[PDB]
Amino acid sequence: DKLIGSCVWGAVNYTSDCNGECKRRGYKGGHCGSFANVNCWCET
């Protein structure tokens, strides 16, 4: 898995489409996965 952005919803790096972005990086899937949604992890 790999980090491609945050998940705080306010910082200058939130990924609304974590997977869309992940795919855009050649990955296969990604989404939030922490406490109170703070980081977006990919499944590289």
Q: Which residues pair with 2 in a beta bridge?
A: 42
CA distance 22 to 43: 9
CA distance 12 to 24: 18
CA distance 10 to 23: 22
Give the CA distances from residue 2 to residues 12, 15, 27, in Å, rounded to whole numbers and listed in that order: 18, 14, 9
Question: DSSP string covering 1-44, please?
Answer: -EEEEE-SSSSTTB-TTHHHHHHHTT-S-EEE-SSSS-EEEE--
Residue 38: alpha-carbon gap to chain centroid = 9
4-42 burial: b if 16+ Cβ within 10 Å, else e: bbbbeeeeeebbeebbebbeeeebeebebbeeeeebbbb
Domains and CATH numbers, the chain: 1-44 (3.30.30.10)
